[PDB]
């Protein structure tokens, strides 16, 4: 945990030496550890509860040793594997580091989501107040972690929060060309009127057009046994029948009935055997599934995929 000196010494950098005159109270002790950093809890000056996420003084020393590091260990393996877009991977991280040092672009994706779910019935995004590389200032979330709600939940709290995660995953494309690109349960909560809380922007995706009606009819043509029309399609969109079934099962399985119960074993039988464009996109997909399993929550995955995924009806 970054001490209480350094800390105030990263908001005097960030937000000026008179930082504290902005709260009506700071809290000292974090509240959670984030991926670089920490987050406090205050109030602002209006009364607002805040969040105030902070960024390590090392983080970007650390980040930067590191991506070297890997840079020199992958040359090592171009030379044996000429093929592997391995400089490619390289490049990705590096662009990634660089976004997350910058908390100016989190802030800027989380002010898209706050104004796409502006009183939104089932979603409450936090406003941005105060934005800086190293620090965000956002109004604070209270609500009941998904972490706390996967271990202890209710069967009625669990299923709230997959339909909300899945509703999130389905519906965000349609509404901001954009995915929440973080499936993981520190990023939600459940709030006491039945909205989900949805924070951390750092590593959103972007889906220009929405989904493309390829992805419902594929999903559809495949419930449907329809193979005729299903494999040119899945061949257009980018083969035993037995391989095509078995790669579709997490996605088919639950939209064969009105409410799924997703669960781990389920899950682990999924698995077991024996295109950038949407590579992202799908990746998230399958993150939401995994939590929706580990939530065990009933959801109602046909009605939703109707209503929010192109070409599914
Ligand atoms: N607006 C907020 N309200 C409540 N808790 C928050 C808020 N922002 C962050 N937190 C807490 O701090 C944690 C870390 O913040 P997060 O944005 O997820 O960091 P990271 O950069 O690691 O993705 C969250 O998992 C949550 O526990
Ligand atoms: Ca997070
Ligand atoms: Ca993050």
Redesign the pocket.
């Known amino acids: 945990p970054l001490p209480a000196a350094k800390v105030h010494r990263v908001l005097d950098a960030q937000l000026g030496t008179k930082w504290r005159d902005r709260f009506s109270s700071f809290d000292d002790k974090p ?7 920490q ?1 406090h809890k205050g109030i602002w000056s209006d009364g607002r509860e805040v ?1 105030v ?1 902070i960024q390590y003084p090392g983080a970007d020393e650390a980040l930067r040793a590191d991506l070297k590091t890997i840079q020199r260990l992958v040359g090592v393996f171009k030379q044996l594997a000429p093929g592997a877009d391995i400089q490619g991977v390289v490049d990705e991280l590096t662009e990634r580091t660089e976004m ?1 040092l910058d908390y100016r672009l ?1 802030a800027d994706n989380q002010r898209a989501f706050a104004k796409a779910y502006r009183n939104d019935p089932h979603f409450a995004v ?1 406003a941005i107040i105060a934005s800086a590389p190293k620090v965000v200032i ?5 609500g009941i ?1 998904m972490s706390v709600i996967i271990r202890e939940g209710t069967p009625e709290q669990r299923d709230l929060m997959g339909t909300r995660l899945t509703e999130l995953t389905f519906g965000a494309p349609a509404r901001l060309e954009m995915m929440h690109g ?1 499936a993981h349960p ?2 939600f ?1 459940l709030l006491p009127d039945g909205r989900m ?1 949805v ?2 922007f ?1 590593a959103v995706a972007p889906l220009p057009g929405g989904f493309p009606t390829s992805l419902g009819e594929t999903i559809r043509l495949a419930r449907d046994k329809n193979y005729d029309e299903l494999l040119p399609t899945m061949e257009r969109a980018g083969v035993s029948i037995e391989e095509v079934e078995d790669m579709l099962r997490q996605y088919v399985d639950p939209i064969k009935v009105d409410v799924f119960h997703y669960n781990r074993k389920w899950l682990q039988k999924m698995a077991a055997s024996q295109p950038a464009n949407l590579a992202i996109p799908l990746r998230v997909i399958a993150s939401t599934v995994a939590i929706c399993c580990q939530l065990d929550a009933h959801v109602p995955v046909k009605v939703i995929a109707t209503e929010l995924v192109p070409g599914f009806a």
Request: glycine share 14%; net charge negative.
């Open positions: 509240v959670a550890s984030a991926s670089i950093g987050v969040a996420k997350e989190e936090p956002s109004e604070w979330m209270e972690p973080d520190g990023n909560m809380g924070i951390d750092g």
